[PDB]
């Protein structure tokens, strides 16, 4: 029951993070949605007690002041890679005075995704969702522990991702707006989880051209269900 | 360059100091601070390089902060002592030299009083006086002129006066404002800026 | 020079059953003394002691660093060092410092821990050890050492002349002397007790 | 079965099943064509969506002025090589002041790919190069293996499916050398379109095309300027 | 080069010449000298310009990896301790450096001076520069800690003319920045050409 | 030198060794702390001294700073390992930034010592799971829990070692704002939650309290045997 | 490469330690010692494991390691497993020396060990000490001081303890039979005595056998004592002499 | 290598250690011989078997000095021998480099058991199969020292190993007591060694060194041949 | 004993305009008092919108600018596009820096249209540090050419002077005519005058001869 961790299936993939893929499973899950006006981002904080404090769980969390970030799994392994895509922002700011593009961060992220070994571990256990608006307007990208990289306009990951792609392909079009987007994505939230939508069980995070930073404090998020 | 003194008495040490923080030819900051408590007992001017006063307290603050907080209870002003002269003498012979020039000032609650010295060679030496800068070529001969081994505190002030008051009549430096700290079996206590008007 | 930045003189003589060691008292910076009770001779074990010399710092780092190694040796074997052991042992702690060397010159002094056999030596500060039979000399004032010694010293000598010589020996030397002085201590050691004794000297 | 575990176990019949296993890895990817005429060379890829909204993960990537790799199987053993052959190409041209020979560059990767295909604890890299650019004696169309046995081709194809792409090029390689540009692509395309099933072809989503020429830098066209070298095709018979 | 900078009741007052030379040469007249950290920080140039240059630089890429890891701006004690630290390594290896940080702090206003030295003193006034001593006098004698706004401007205006008529290296303009609650925020950058026919009459 | 990797992931999606070792923290003392407003308490239990020894040297309630105090589970010595690194690391923080260190700064130290001490190779993890406490400037008082994954967590009020789950349940009905009113009720809402653990005959009780502005200070045992005599007292009012 | 290795680093199943356990067994058997304190005073009690006829025991020293001028250890388990450590812990209590000019505390001394041997336990998959030791000591804070040491790296204060599988029926004894603070340093030696007479099936208790090492506080000495081999035998002979004179009441 | 650095040797489920155990199984397979203290030096008897007629006897050696006083002989494997031979030549020098002193007994047995415990618990070796027999007249009373791949070490009166080790167990217990000569230590020894020996014991049979107060000396097979009369 | 630095001469001018950039030097390379060749121009187009001077000693010069040219490639490898002009200047500062204890000897002038296509004229010195200017000139003949172009482009020192833009076509002609009032009192300044024009539409080079000796 003790095989390589780095060796190729008889089949030919791979052993090990083929069950990577299997870990995001048992996360919450989380959606995000590129817009023409801007990025929109939700998800899920799974509340166990009410003993438990609730602004202490935190999904999404800031790299820079123009780009956001949704996690989905193992929570420490991704606070590995957050502080590391923090500081290589500011390696690229303080050695050219520009703000590294949403893409560019993930390929600083996505060389370390499989670096895993003896000399010079195993895999990381998260998928991300980074979004963010740079100089060709708002974008939203979507990566993995295998380190495939690739650009989606409206992605849905965690536990219940499979229901939540499908309903989304329904209810996207291009021509969208940033309002309808975000009470869009929130039906699509009640749909996928077991408890009463209220303004402790979500969060949202959106992030604009004009308003450059994402800004959701509480009771902004009692306004939205209210209007559902 | 700048004056200490450490008149040491039966069951107290009477420290004292100045605030003045010089510059090439002004004074920046006239109300500097040269001492450093390193537990309730414990004091530590100091005297010397302008970048290796600060890091040096800073260095010896912290190592004498682990062993209260790991094992519980406080060193002794003689373990304090020795415990600088070693980091003192293991990077003398190194690349980067250290250049400082200050003792401590301990009270022991089974030993008492105590006082030391320091060089920047990193020699020790138990006193019963002691001082540092130019200004200790003016002031030990009135220490060892009006001195008792059994004096009180009173006294020991006004001691500190006669010798404070031969400081602003020979001198080429300025040195307006002292401040003045006194160790007992209480602990630290400060006492009064002894300060010398202008107008 | 660097030797006579602090002073000091270190003498050790050897008499008949027993031997006598002294030291003066100051401690000083170049022209301005500090103290009067600036130890320079430590006990390393009992009927055996060492004297130092030279740079202040030198003196109390080798002094601790030897009490380190000494500790050891007295716990891996039973027996207690011999005087010959020691001198060996001193002799490896200064060479290894070839080239940044320490500035200090031992003496050691001491019986046999099995007869009433007597032992003096005297190194360099790089580790040249020096066995004699009647004195050894240490410090900056060497020359007005040995004029005493050479003028003074006896074969075979009683525990009483043997202090009334080494005391006119140190008190006419020390005092021609600048930078060293005020006051000197005297450690006379035999079979059956160990004798300290502080001389009156000129405290100028 | 037993010793078919590690890389530094042969077999008792000689055959390391480590790198028979990499072999199958390059035949997940999708398919993509290389060849060259007498004075280009050109390599046409094809590409493949996660899901609808998902864009389609690119195959063609520039590497120098005069040399572009197209790329089957991982995406890790993609870039750490992709990171060695920018590198290297970029070393002789701040030495020497001269574009590397595209074919003593090649001979660089089976040397970098050697060693963790013979040492304990390091898998081969799944990986299946074609290369083409110029070195002062005109084009080239390489292709690799996780083996490391380097290929002077003149016109391959790796990846699903690949078996009907070959099949296309020997009735047809000898075509391959007076014909320009405009039916030289779209000779490459029609081979292509048998790796497909038989109800879509190239609808300007999910192909790509790089081209080295004489007087021609390595450029990478994407579903836009494509759509010239689209038309004038026949349809699929049946 | 001179720079000077004060604290009073209603926050920091920052001000400094534009003049950088070369030998007996003038490089230019117009060299921004107080180097725009954060919203909420300023720093100073003083000798080696781009050492000061370089290191306050350096010494933003910690203070914005601090906020973002503590979700809190940092203090300015703290940003002064840092700076020590770094050019402390470099002691004896020719740094010339010997700027100021101000800012406003959970503690009130900021004001501390770092050398390439080592030194890292708080304080009320400073001045710095190689015609430094001229700003000393001047405003030592117009200073108080109960000013206004506009009499603090005018102070810290003429104490930067008084020293670049005195001194030769330094001159050019009169920059001035002014440090809130809020943040910084610039007052005005005059010449001195015309601050001459100001204070003629 | 033990390059061999301990830790891997299994066949339906899980770490055996993080999931292998919170078992070791179920086998151990329980702990509890809840926070007040300005005094906050905490009170392990199950002493079970020996009744001829000594118990200075069993001391499971420890400090790093002056602001911060420390409670655990697990086994005993690896605990002494994350304590006297933690202490060094809050000291070498006022070595820097001078500031006193920020209870929220330190758990993130011990957490991310705790995470790479399970991803790197041929180390087996840690085995505690520590509380928290501390009051730190501006006087907000808070407390934050630990794991062996290394996932730093505020809560409001913890229970851990055997009978975690129990002594949380108790305080899971027991939500009310008016216990953390008067801070010698607070006390005595930690001692009646102490009750409901094993056998807490008024001697396996170890509380100790801090007031945010003094060093903790570990209650007598008399006062144990008198806010247990309120708690009987309190308790005869249900007729 | 792989299959060779042992695996000492992982938990048990059960959810606890998998070789640890099987180290600790081992200190119960080949060896028992004990040591008592509840005044100015403390001893140690020996045991001879091998005590055949043709041995030399021309070391004049024993199982009782003098490890300091104010402390000394009885160690039992696998024997040249302790002379790592008391080489060890020796230059441990040195270094302490160098550093401050001032003797080591006891407790710090044995934090310093059990970090040792919990660093073998934690990483690496080497294999773990099996040793478990006694320490006896006097120091400027609490006097004399008791401390049993595990292969865990945990330790703790005592004042009566107890080593080996044999001597796990003596720690029913020592809660019986002990004090408060009454340790006239002829009770703790006639219930040294009295202890390794039940417990040690060896009968009569021949005086080769066992041994006994003491440390009384001087003026500023701190004497060491191994007391030899005469005194044993009156004492036994006094234990035996209260044996015949309490059975009287039969 | 490679850095993999662990340790072959663990606890057993009992609570022993296997390895060990099975290295004392090829030292009790080993050559017999004997070593014995008697009040003014020590003597030490091998038994060297040539299994053929064709092997030199002058070349291979079993009674080793290390220094003019301190000898060494073992029961054992041959080629593990030579490697603590050397080691143990280095060891004394580095105490007569320090010390300027002849090396005690005692202390060699302190440091050449730590080579040997530590290098059974250090990583990826076996430890040794041989068992030793070190001697010396050091400060006048002469000393008999027995270490063992268990990393232990004794302190016999008179002791044997090799095979039959208990046979000369009981007959050194009975034969020999408490005070000898050199001169009567050598009768016995032979006489335990012709215990186990095989028919004819010539000068190339046996091989003996001795300790005295004088100094470490190996027999010349002269002297062994000449002391042969009045056999065992 | 072996001196590393050595100086070579030569003169760098470059003017921000409204939309566009002039870059100009000569082509003399000389060393102590003999002249290596008279074919040596300092004009670099790194991109499409920026040229590089680079004066002092030449050994430095040719090994800074094969740097430059490897980390443009780098940059679009890793980010799909090309530097601006202000991103090259901020990461020249950094190479610049990074041999503080053992530095180059070159002074270093970029020219060229921002991302609005305006001309913008960054200065540099030895060690790194810099800033955006309307004019600088540097080399040998720095002094002999700072002060002309303050009064002709600064307009500064002169009453009831208008402000009028700077053309392209004047300030053809106030190129030309310093770089003949520098040879005449330079000895470094030689004969060919290679100028660079940045435009919004591409760099054109030109030629101008000077005196010969």
Same mark, same amino acid.
């Given at each position: ?66 780009? #956001? ?47 895993? #070994? ?6 990381? #256990? ?5 979004? #963010? ?96 | ?199 | ?204 | 079965?037993?010793?078919? *575990? ?9 055959? /390391?099943?480590? /790198? ?128 490391? *046995? ?60 790089? /081209? ?7 450029? /990478? ?18 | ?201 | ?239 | ?250 | 290598?490679?850095?993999? !650095? ?9 609570? &022993? ?19 014995? &203290? ?13 299994? !053929? ?5 002058? !070349? ?57 415990? %530590?290098?059974?618990? !250090? ?50 217990? &009975? ?31 046996? %091989?003996?060194?001795?300790?005295? %107060? ?19 | ?8 001469? $030569? ?47 030449? $050994? ?77 000139? $540097? ?75």
């Amino acid at each position: 029951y003790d095989r390589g961790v780095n060796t190729f299936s008889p089949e030919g993939r791979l052993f090990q993070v083929e069950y990577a893929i299997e870990a995001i499973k048992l996360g919450s899950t989380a959606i995000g949605i590129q817009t023409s006006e801007g990025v929109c981002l939700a998800v899920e904080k799974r509340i166990t007690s009410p003993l438990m404090e609730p602004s202490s769980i935190e999904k999404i969390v800031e790299i820079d002041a123009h780009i #956001g970030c949704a996690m989905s799994g193992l929570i420490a392994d991704a606070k590995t890679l957050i502080d590391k895509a923090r500081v290589e922002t500011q390696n690229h700011w303080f050695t050219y005075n520009e703000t590294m593009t949403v893409e560019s961060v993930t390929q600083a992220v996505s060389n370390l995704a499989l670096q895993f #070994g003896e000399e010079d571990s195993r895999p990381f #256990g998260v998928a991300l969702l980074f979004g #963010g608006v740079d100089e060709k307007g708002p974008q939203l990208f979507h990566m993995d522990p295998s380190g495939t990289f690739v650009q989606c306009d409206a992605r849905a990951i965690g536990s219940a991702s499979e229901g939540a792609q499908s309903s989304l392909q329904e209810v996207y079009h291009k021509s969208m707006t940033l309002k309808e987007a975000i009470k869009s994505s929130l039906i699509i939230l009640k749909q996928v989880m077991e408890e009463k939508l209220n303004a402790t069980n979500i969060e949202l995070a959106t992030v604009q051209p004009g308003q450059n930073f994402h800004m959701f404090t509480k009771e902004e998020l009692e306004e939205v269900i209210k209007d559902i | 360059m700048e004056y200490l003194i450490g008149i040491q008495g039966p069951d107290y040490v009477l420290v004292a100091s100045d605030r003045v923080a010089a510059s090439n030819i002004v004074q920046m900051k006239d109300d500097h601070d040269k001492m450093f408590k390193m537990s309730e007992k414990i004091l530590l001017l100091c005297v010397g390089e302008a970048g290796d006063t600060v890091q040096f307290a800073e260095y010896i603050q912290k190592n004498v902060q682990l062993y209260k907080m790991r094992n519980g209870y406080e060193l002794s002003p003689t373990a304090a002592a020795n415990f600088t002269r070693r980091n003192l003498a293991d990077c003398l012979r190194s690349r980067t030299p250290y250049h400082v020039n200050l003792l401590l000032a301990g009270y022991d609650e089974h030993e008492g009083p105590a006082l030391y010295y320091m060089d920047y060679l990193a020699a020790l030496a138990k006193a019963p006086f002691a001082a540092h800068g130019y200004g200790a070529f003016l002031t030990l001969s009135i220490l060892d002129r009006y001195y008792t081994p059994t004096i009180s505190r009173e006294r020991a002030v006004e001691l500190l006066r006669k010798c404070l008051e031969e400081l602003q009549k020979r001198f080429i430096l300025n040195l307006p404002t002292f401040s003045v700290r006194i160790i007992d079996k209480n602990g630290i206590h400060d006492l009064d800026n002894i300060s010398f008007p202008k107008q | 020079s660097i030797m006579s930045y602090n002073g000091g003189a270190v003498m050790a003589m050897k008499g008949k059953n027993c031997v006598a060691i002294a030291a003066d008292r100051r401690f000083g910076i170049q022209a301005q003394m500090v103290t009067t009770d600036f130890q320079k001779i430590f006990p390393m074990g009992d009927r055996l002691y060492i004297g130092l010399a030279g740079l202040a710092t030198d003196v109390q780092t080798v002094a601790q660093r030897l009490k380190f190694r000494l500790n050891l040796y007295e716990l891996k074997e039973g027996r207690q060092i011999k005087p010959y052991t020691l001198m060996s042992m001193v002799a490896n702690l200064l060479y290894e410092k070839r080239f940044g060397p320490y500035y200090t010159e031992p003496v050691i002094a001491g019986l046999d821990p099995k007869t009433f056999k007597p032992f003096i030596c005297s190194l360099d500060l790089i580790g040249c050890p020096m066995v004699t039979d009647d004195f050894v000399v240490s410090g900056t004032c060497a020359e007005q050492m040995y004029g005493m010694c050479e003028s003074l010293w006896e074969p075979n000598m009683d525990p009483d002349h043997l202090f009334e010589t080494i005391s006119q020996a140190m008190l006419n030397a020390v005092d021609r002397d600048a930078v060293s002085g005020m006051g000197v201590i005297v450690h006379i050691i035999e079979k059956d007790k160990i004798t300290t004794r502080t001389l009156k000297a000129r405290m100028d | 079965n037993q010793y078919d *575990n590690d890389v530094t176990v042969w077999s008792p019949q000689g055959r /390391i099943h480590q /790198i028979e296993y990499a072999m199958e890895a390059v035949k997940q990817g999708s398919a993509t064509v290389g060849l060259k005429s007498k004075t280009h060379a050109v390599l046409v890829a094809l590409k493949r969506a996660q899901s609808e909204l998902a864009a389609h993960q690119k195959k063609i990537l520039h590497v120098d002025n005069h040399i572009g790799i197209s790329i089957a199987g991982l995406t890790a053993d993609a870039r750490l090589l992709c990171n060695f052959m920018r590198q290297e190409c970029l070393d002789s041209r701040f030495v020497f002041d001269r574009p590397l020979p595209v074919s003593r560059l090649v001979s660089l990767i089976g040397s970098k790919t050697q060693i963790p295909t013979q040492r304990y604890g390091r898998r081969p890299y799944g990986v299946g190069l074609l290369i083409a650019g110029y070195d002062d004696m005109g084009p080239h169309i390489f292709q690799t293996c996780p083996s490391a *046995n380097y290929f002077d081709c003149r016109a391959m194809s790796i990846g699903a499916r690949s078996q009907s792409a070959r099949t296309y090029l020997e009735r047809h390689m000898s075509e391959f050398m007076e014909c320009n540009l405009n039916e030289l692509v779209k000779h490459g395309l029609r081979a292509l379109r048998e790796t497909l099933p038989a109800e879509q072809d190239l609808t300007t989503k999910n192909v790509s095309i790089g /081209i080295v020429g004489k007087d021609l830098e390595f450029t /990478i066209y994407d579903d836009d300027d494509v759509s010239p070298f689209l038309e004038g095709l026949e349809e699929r018979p049946q | 080069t001179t720079t000077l900078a004060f604290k009073f009741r209603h926050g920091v007052i920052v001000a400094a010449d534009s003049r950088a030379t070369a030998g007996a040469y003038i490089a230019s007249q117009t060299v921004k000298k107080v180097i725009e950290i954060n919203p909420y920080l300023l720093g100073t140039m003083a000798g080696g310009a781009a050492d000061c240059s370089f290191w306050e630089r350096l010494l933003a890429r910690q203070c914005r990896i601090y906020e973002l890891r503590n979700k809190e701006r940092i203090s300015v004690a703290a940003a002064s301790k840092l700076l020590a630290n770094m050019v402390y390594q470099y002691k004896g290896m020719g740094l010339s450096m010997g700027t100021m940080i101000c800012g406003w702090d959970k503690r009130g206003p900021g004001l501390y001076y770092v050398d390439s030295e080592g030194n890292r003193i708080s304080g009320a006034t400073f001045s710095v520069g190689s015609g430094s001593v001229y700003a000393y006098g001047v405003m030592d004698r117009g200073y108080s800690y109960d000013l206004e706004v506009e009499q603090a401007y005018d102070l810290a205006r003429r104490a930067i003319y008084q020293a670049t008529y005195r001194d030769a290296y330094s001159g050019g303009a009169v920059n001035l920045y002014h440090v809130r609650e809020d943040g910084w925020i610039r007052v005005s950058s005059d010449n001195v050409a015309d601050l001459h026919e100001k204070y003629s009459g | 030198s033990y390059d061999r990797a301990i830790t891997v992931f299994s066949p339906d999606g899980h770490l055996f060794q993080v999931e292998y070792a919170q078992e070791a923290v179920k086998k151990g003392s329980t702990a509890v702390g809840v926070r007040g407003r300005d005094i906050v308490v905490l009170g392990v239990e199950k002493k079970s001294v020996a009744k001829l020894q000594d118990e200075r040297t069993v001391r499971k309630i420890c400090a790093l700073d002056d602001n911060v105090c420390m409670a655990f589970a697990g086994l005993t010595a690896d605990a002494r390992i994350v304590i006297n690194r933690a202490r060094v690391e809050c000291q070498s923080h006022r070595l820097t930034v001078e500031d006193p260190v920020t209870v929220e700064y330190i758990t993130r130290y011990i957490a991310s010592l705790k995470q790479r001490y399970t991803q790197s190779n041929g180390r087996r993890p840690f085995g505690i799971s520590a509380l928290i406490v501390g009051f730190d400037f501006d006087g907000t008082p808070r407390l934050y829990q630990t794991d062996p994954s290394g996932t730093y967590h505020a809560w409001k009020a913890n229970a851990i070692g055997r009978g975690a789950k129990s002594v949380r349940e108790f305080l899971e009905k027991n939500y009310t704002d008016e216990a953390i009113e008067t801070d010698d009720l607070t006390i005595k809402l930690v001692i009646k939650a102490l009750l409901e653990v094993v056998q807490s005959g008024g001697k396996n009780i170890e509380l100790a309290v801090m007031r945010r502005d003094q060093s903790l200070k570990i209650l007598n045992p008399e006062e144990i045997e008198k806010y247990v005599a309120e708690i009987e007292k309190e308790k005869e009012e249900n007729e | 490469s792989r299959r060779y290795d042992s695996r000492t680093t992982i938990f048990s199943p059960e959810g606890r330690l998998y070789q640890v356990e099987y180290a600790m067994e081992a200190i119960g058997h080949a060896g028992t010692c004990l040591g008592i304190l509840a005044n100015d005073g403390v001893l140690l009690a020996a045991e001879r494991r091998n005590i055949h006829k043709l041995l030399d025991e021309v070391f004049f020293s024993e199982k009782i390691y003098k490890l300091n001028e104010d402390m000394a250890c009885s160690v039992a388990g696998i024997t040249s497993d302790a002379n790592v450590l008391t080489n060890e812990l020796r230059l441990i209590a040195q270094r302490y020396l160098l550093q401050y000019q001032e003797p080591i505390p006891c407790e710090q001394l044995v934090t310093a060990l059990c970090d040792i041997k919990q660093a073998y336990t934690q990483f690496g998959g080497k294999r773990p000490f099996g040793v478990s030791l006694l320490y006896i000591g006097w120091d400027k804070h609490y006097g004399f001081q008791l401390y049993q040491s595990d292969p865990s790296g945990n330790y703790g204060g005592w004042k009566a303890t107890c080593i080996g599988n044999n001597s796990a029926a003596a720690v029913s004894m020592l809660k019986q039979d002990y004090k408060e603070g009454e340790m006239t340093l002829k009770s703790a030696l006639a219930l040294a005595i009295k202890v390794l007479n039940k417990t040690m099936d060896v009968s009569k208790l021949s005086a080769e056998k066992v041994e006994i090492a003491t440390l009384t506080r001087e003026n500023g000495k701190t004497v060491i004592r191994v007391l030899k081999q005469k005194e044993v035998e009156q004492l036994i002979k006094k234990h035996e002499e209260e044996e015949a004179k309490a059975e009287r009441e039969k | 290598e490679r850095g993999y !650095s662990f340790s072959l040797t663990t606890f057993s489920p009992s609570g &022993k250690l296997v390895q060990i155990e099975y290295a004392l199984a090829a030292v009790a397979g080993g050559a017999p011989s004997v070593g014995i &203290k008697a009040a003014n030096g020590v003597v030490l008897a091998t038994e060297k078997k040539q299994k !053929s007629i064709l092997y030199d006897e002058r !070349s291979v050696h079993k009674v080793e000095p290390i220094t003019k006083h301190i000898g060494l002989v073992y029961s054992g494997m041959g080629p593990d021998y030579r490697v603590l031979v050397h080691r143990a030549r280095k060891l004394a020098q580095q105490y007569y480099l320090v010390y300027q002193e002849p090396i005690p007994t005692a202390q060699l047995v302190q440091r050449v058991a730590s080579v040997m415990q %530590e290098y059974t618990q !250090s990583g990826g070796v076996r430890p040794f199969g041989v068992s030793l027999l070190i001697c010396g007249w050091n400060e006048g009373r002469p000393y008999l020292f027995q270490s063992d791949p268990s990393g232990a070490y004794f302190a016999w009166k008179a002791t044997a190993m090799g095979k039959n080790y208990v046979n000369g167990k009981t007959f050194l217990e &009975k034969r020999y007591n408490e005070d000898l000569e050199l001169e009567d230590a050598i009768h016995t020894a032979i006489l335990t060694l012709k215990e186990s020996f095989e028919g004819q014991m010539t000068e190339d049979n046996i %091989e003996v060194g001795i300790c005295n %107060e004088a100094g470490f000396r190996r027999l010349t097979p002269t002297e062994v041949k000449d002391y042969l009369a009045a056999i065992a | 004993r072996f001196s590393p630095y050595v100086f070579n001469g $030569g003169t760098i001018l470059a003017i921000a305009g409204e939309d566009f950039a002039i870059v100009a030097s000569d082509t003399r390379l000389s060393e102590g008092f003999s002249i290596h060749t008279r074919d040596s121009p300092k004009c670099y187009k790194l991109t499409d919108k920026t040229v590089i001077g680079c004066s002092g000693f030449h $050994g430095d010069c040719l090994t800074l600018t094969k740097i430059i040219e490897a980390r443009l490639k780098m940059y679009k490898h890793s980010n799909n596009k090309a530097m601006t002009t202000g991103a090259i200047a901020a990461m020249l500062s950094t190479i610049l820096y990074s041999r503080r204890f053992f530095p180059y000897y070159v002074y270093n002038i970029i020219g060229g249209l921002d991302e609005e296509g305006k001309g913008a004229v960054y200065s540099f010195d030895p060690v790194g540090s810099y800033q955006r200017d309307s004019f600088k000139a $540097g080399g040998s003949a720095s002094a002999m050419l700072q002060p002309l172009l303050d009064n002709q482009v600064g307009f500064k020192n002169m009453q009831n002077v208008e402000h009028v833009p700077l053309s392209l076509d004047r300030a053809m002609r106030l190129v030309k005519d310093v770089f003949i009032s520098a040879a005449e009192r330079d000895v470094y300044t030689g004969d060919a005058l290679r100028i660079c024009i940045v435009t919004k539409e591409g760099i054109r080079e030109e030629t101008v001869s000077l005196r010969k000796d």
